[PDB]
Amino acid sequence: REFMAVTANNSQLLTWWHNTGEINTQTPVADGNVRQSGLYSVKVQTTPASSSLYYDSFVYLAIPGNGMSDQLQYTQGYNQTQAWTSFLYSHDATVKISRNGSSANSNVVIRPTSLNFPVRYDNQSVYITVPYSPTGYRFSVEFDDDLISLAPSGARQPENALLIFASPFENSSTKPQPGSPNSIAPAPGRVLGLNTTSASTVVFNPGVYYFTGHDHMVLSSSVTWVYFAPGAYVKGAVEFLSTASEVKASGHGVLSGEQYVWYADPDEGYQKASGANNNGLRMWRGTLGNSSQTFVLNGVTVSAPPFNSMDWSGNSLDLITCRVDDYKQVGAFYGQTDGLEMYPGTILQDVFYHTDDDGLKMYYSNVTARNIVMWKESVAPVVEFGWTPRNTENVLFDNVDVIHQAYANAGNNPGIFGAVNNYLYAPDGLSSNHSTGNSNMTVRNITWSNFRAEGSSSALFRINPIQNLDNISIKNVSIESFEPLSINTTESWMPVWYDLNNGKQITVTDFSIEGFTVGNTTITASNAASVGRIDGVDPAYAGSVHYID
Numbered sequence: 001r002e003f004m005a006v007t008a009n010n011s012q013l014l015t016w017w018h019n020t021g022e023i024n025t026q027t028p029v030a031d032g033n034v035r036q037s038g039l040y041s042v043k044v045q046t047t048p049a050s051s052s053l054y055y056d057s058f059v060y061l062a063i064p065g066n067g068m069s070d071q072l073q074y075t076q077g078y079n080q081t082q083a084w085t086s087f088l089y090s091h092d093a094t095v096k097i098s099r100n101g102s103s104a105n106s107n108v109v110i111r112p113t114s115l116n117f118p119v120r121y122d123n124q125s126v127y128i129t130v131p132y133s134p135t136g137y138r139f140s141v142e143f144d145d146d147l148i149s150l151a152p153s154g155a156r157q158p159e160n161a162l163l164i165f166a167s168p169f170e171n172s173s174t175k176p177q178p179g180s181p182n183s184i185a186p187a188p189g190r191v192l193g194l195n196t197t198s199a200s201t202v203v204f205n206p207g208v209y210y211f212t213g214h215d216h217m218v219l220s221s222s223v224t225w226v227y228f229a230p231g232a233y234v235k236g237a238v239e240f241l242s243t244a245s246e247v248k249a250s251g252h253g254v255l256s257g258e259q260y261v262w263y264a265d266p267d268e269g270y271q272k273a274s275g276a277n278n279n280g281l282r283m284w285r286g287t288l289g290n291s292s293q294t295f296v297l298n299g300v301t302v303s304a305p306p307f308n309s310m311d312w313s314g315n316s317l318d319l320i321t322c323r324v325d326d327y328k329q330v331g332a333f334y335g336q337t338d339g340l341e342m343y344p345g346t347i348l349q350d351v352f353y354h355t356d357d358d359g360l361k362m363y364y365s366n367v368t369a370r371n372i373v374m375w376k377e378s379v380a381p382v383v384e385f386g387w388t389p390r391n392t393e394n395v396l397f398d399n400v401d402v403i404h405q406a407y408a409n410a411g412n413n414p415g416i417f418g419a420v421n422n423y424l425y426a427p428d429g430l431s432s433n434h435s436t437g438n439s440n441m442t443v444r445n446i447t448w449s450n451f452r453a454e455g456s457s458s459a460l461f462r463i464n465p466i467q468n469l470d471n472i473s474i475k476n477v478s479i480e481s482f483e484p485l486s487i488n489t490t491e492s493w494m495p496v497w498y499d500l501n502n503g504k505q506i507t508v509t510d511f512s513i514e515g516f517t518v519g520n521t522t523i524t525a526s527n528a529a530s531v532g533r534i535d536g537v538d539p540a541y542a543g544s545v546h547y548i549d
């Protein structure tokens, strides 16, 4: 018969497909269609590797502008595309990757490179044995002959990226049981009525769904759980109205905002905001009243966000907490595509972030973030914590691997660990005025450990002490290479700041740096400025920065 895709649905492997898959690299795909990579084909086989059957795994594709060329002006202007595929597994599986048909056998680099997965090359195909892990893996497959140079960085990256998201099977907490009378499973196509449903659980089963570029998934206050099934692709953005103790979004399906123009404003008919009112539609939005609320985000893949990926409403933002895992953000070519907000008590792990702005927002206390892979694009620091003075304490960011960076200039506020200026007086985050700080607030007990930057990289840190700093320690951080010196992006700095009202000097205390390597050079105090390129530490703080071995 006519060739058909064959997907896996067993206790060891699960892959899916979309019959309305559309190969398109220039315009918006049809409503009921899903942009599919015409360059990469993926099949997965549960080990042991035998002449047995290999199952197809749909390869998604996100492109800058989302086919809207009059939208490219809001991207960094590169011609890079991002393809990806996800699958669930419970046992070691071999991933077979194929291309065009005129493609020669090219070498591939897996990122993070720490994975060290077995890689075989056979007849214009790449065989990657992916080991099973209760936390799955998120990695980039980069074909040498597909690498290009991004100006002015010169960063060598894939023109056509391919991401693989191998996740563990879903449990009773992340996958609703079918047939519950208190849940509603909207059929494929335009989705309507979820904003007034009496259901408490929205279930999107395999299939394509879409709100428009002029409407999003507002869930009734009654809704506390949104599930995107593996094989489900939903075009829209979600907003809970519920103020219950917990609201949840799970499943390994896709939530794509490809239909919204950049900075789409719900209050202005989803049109580009009138004047940067910071009302660009978020992919994850919620609201809390007087009671605390936990936001659970699990397994979902968010693509093409039209603005900041997430933000909650309220005056009691410290009453919110997050629990996210096995979550991904791909195809975020638009600017200001911030990663999630991590409210007090948050625990985030095994996340993949493709972002053109503030990545890890360290704005709240008692936060734990680990096992993150970041494909930072061209703006904002990897880690941000400097738009507004605040009291923040007890933060741990461990095992973070920035696989790529493509900064252009200083105005991009580059750097791994950054803290831009006070947005109230320097909205763009850059200004010589360092006298708008608050000597009454302090950020303390901060630990950034096991950070890693592959390829060329920006400065280790560019921190503006807008409030006091105390007990901040960097442990094990390696920068494979620095970006071109001429672009003003590799030197770290930390200028003395002053209180806005009192004029009192902002203090920095116990800022330690341990295990900092640049290439094959282990940095130390007598190495700081030489290789480490740490030149900007203000003499007033020099005594507070310690290079311990």
Ligand SMILES: *[C@@H]1O[C@H](CO)[C@@H](O)[C@H](O)[C@H]1NC(C)=O
Binding pocket: 007, 009, 015, 016, 206, 230, 231
């Ligand atoms: C197999 O996977 C499909 C989606 O690809 C899912 O809808 C279905 O429930 C699975 N079959 C079962 C019940 O094992």
Ligand SMILES: *[C@@H]1O[C@H](CO)[C@@H](O)[C@H](O)[C@H]1NC(C)=O
Binding pocket: 079, 080, 148, 149, 150, 151, 159
């Ligand atoms: C994409 O941009 C790269 C440089 O960033 C360039 O080398 C490549 O030719 C471009 N794609 C094409 C084939 O137009």
Ligand SMILES: *[C@@H]1O[C@H](CO)[C@@H](O)[C@H](O)[C@H]1NC(C)=O
Binding pocket: 193, 195, 196, 215, 218
């Ligand atoms: C519910 O959503 C629809 C879809 O756009 C919208 O037209 C309607 O005004 C909304 N009703 C509510 C709950 O305000």
Ligand SMILES: *[C@@H]1O[C@H](CO)[C@@H](O)[C@H](O)[C@H]1NC(C)=O
Binding pocket: 318, 344, 345, 365, 366, 394
């Ligand atoms: C952080 O945790 C500590 C102790 O667990 C607690 O005293 C403090 O209030 C917390 N801060 C916030 C903003 O939740």
Ligand SMILES: *[C@@H]1O[C@H](CO)[C@@H](O)[C@H](O)[C@H]1NC(C)=O
Binding pocket: 394, 395, 396, 445, 446, 447
């Ligand atoms: C400091 O932060 C760490 C996070 O690694 C936490 O385990 C510890 O309890 C905090 N200690 C203080 C000062 O409460």
Ligand SMILES: *[C@@H]1O[C@H](CO)[C@@H](O)[C@H](O)[C@H]1NC(C)=O
Binding pocket: 425, 433, 434, 435, 436
């Ligand atoms: C910025 O610094 C200047 C000192 O040069 C100070 O007078 C001003 O109040 C600060 N912030 C602003 C622009 O309000």
Ligand SMILES: *[C@@H]1O[C@H](CO)[C@@H](O)[C@H](O)[C@H]1NC(C)=O
Binding pocket: 437, 438, 439, 440, 499, 500, 501, 502
């Ligand atoms: C710091 O606290 C003092 C005393 O309450 C106050 O006068 C001053 O304005 C505060 N500084 C800032 C940055 O608000």
Ligand SMILES: *[C@@H]1O[C@H](CO)[C@@H](O)[C@H](O)[C@H]1NC(C)=O
Binding pocket: 449, 450, 475, 476, 515
């Ligand atoms: C720092 O790196 C060393 C070498 O791999 C490792 O043994 C140690 O546990 C790391 N420390 C932290 C902060 O995890």
Ligand SMILES: *[C@@H]1O[C@H](CO)[C@@H](O)[C@H](O)[C@H]1NC(C)=O
Binding pocket: 409, 410, 486, 487, 488
């Ligand atoms: C980079 O910085 C140097 C010194 O700070 C400056 O002279 C140069 O103009 C900057 N390059 C540009 C234009 O980005």
